[PDB]
Amino acid sequence: SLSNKLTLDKLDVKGKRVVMRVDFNVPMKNNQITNNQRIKAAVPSIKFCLDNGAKSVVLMSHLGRPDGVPMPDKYSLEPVAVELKSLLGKDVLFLKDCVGPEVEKACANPAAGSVILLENLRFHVEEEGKGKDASGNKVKAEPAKIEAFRASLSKLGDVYVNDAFGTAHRAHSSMVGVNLPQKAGGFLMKKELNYFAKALESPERPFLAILGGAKFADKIQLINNMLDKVNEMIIGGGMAFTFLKVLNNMEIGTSLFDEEGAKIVKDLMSKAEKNGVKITLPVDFVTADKFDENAKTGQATVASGIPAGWMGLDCGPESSKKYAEAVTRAKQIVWNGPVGVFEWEAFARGTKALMDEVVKATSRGCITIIGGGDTATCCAKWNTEDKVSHVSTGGGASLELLEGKVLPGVDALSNI
Ligand SMILES: Nc1ncnc2c1ncn2[C@@H]1O[C@H](COP(=O)(O)OP(=O)(O)O)[C@@H](O)[C@H]1O
Ligand SMILES: [Mg+2]
Ligand SMILES: [Mg+2]
Ligand SMILES: [Mg+2]
Cis-peptide into 408, omega within 30 deg: no
State in Å: Cα 336 to ligand 1 middle: 10
Establish whether residue 338 lines the binding site of ligand 1, counting it when its CB lies within 6 angstroms of any ligand atom: yes
149/201 Cα distance (integer angstroms): 36
3-state secondary structure of 195: helix
Q: Among residues 284, 287, 235, 283, which one has the least CA distance to residue 261?
A: 235
Q: Is the CB of 337 under 6 A from ligand 1?
A: yes
Burial 146-158 (b: 16+ CB within 10 A, else e): beebbebbbbbbb
Active site residue 10: no
- Rounded to an integer, what distance in angstroms lies between the CA atom of residue 68 and that of residue 125? 4
Per the CB < 8 A criterion, the answer to whether 250 and 207 are in contact is: no
Write down the experimental method used for this entry.
Answer: X-ray
Q: Which atom of ligand 1 is nearest to the CA of 344?
A: 27
Q: CB pairs under 8 A, 24+ apart, for 382-391?
A: 382/352, 382/355, 384/355, 384/359, 387/359, 387/362, 388/358, 388/359, 388/362, 389/195, 389/362, 390/191, 390/192, 390/195
CA 229 – ligand 3 centroid, Å: 24
Nearest to 77 by CA among 44, 116, 20: 116
The annotation status of 237 as a binding-site residue, yes or no, is: yes
Please confirm, yes or no, whether 215 is among the known catalytic residues: yes
**Catalytic position from the list 85, 373, 381, 387:** 373
Asked if 136 is an active-site residue, the reply is no
Ligand 1 nearest-atom number relative to CA 237: 8
Q: What is the resolution of this structure in A?
A: 1.8
Tell me the CATH architecture of domain 3-188.
3-Layer(aba) Sandwich (3.40)
Helix (H) or strand (E) holding 175: helix 173-176
Give the SS3 label for residue 300: strand
d(CA 141, CA 135): 16
Q: How far is the CA of 53 from the CAs of 11, 15, 16, 189, in angstroms?
A: 12, 6, 8, 21
Does residue 350 have its Cβ closer than 6 Å to ligand 1? no
Give, for 16, the enclosing helix (H) or strand (E): none
Residue 188 CA to ligand 3 center (angstroms) comes to 15
Q: Are 408 and 176 in contact (CB under 8 A)?
A: yes
Count of CB atoms situated within 10 Å of the CB of 348: 22
Residue 17 annotated in ligand binding: no
Chain centroid offset of residue 237 CA: 19
Which CATH code fits 195-403? 3.40.50.1260
Give CA separation, 42 vs 89, 99, 187, in Å.
14, 22, 8
Mark whether 373 is an active-site residue.
yes
From 282, 266, 285, select the one nearest 233 (Cα to Cα): 282
Under 8 Å CB-to-CB from 195, ≥6 apart: which residues? Answer: 367, 369, 389, 390, 392
Q: How far apart are CA 416 and CA 9, in angstroms?
A: 13
DSSP 7: B
The ranges assigned to domains in the chain are 3-188, 195-403
| Residue 213 in contact with ligand 1 by CB distance below 6 A | yes
Element (H, E) at 31: none
Does the fold of domain 195-403 match that of domain 3-188?
yes
In 3-state terms, what secondary structure has residue 172?
coil
Query: How far apart are the CA of 374 and the centre of ligand 1, in A?
Result: 7
Decide whether any atom of ligand 1 lies within 6 Å of the 258 Cβ.
no
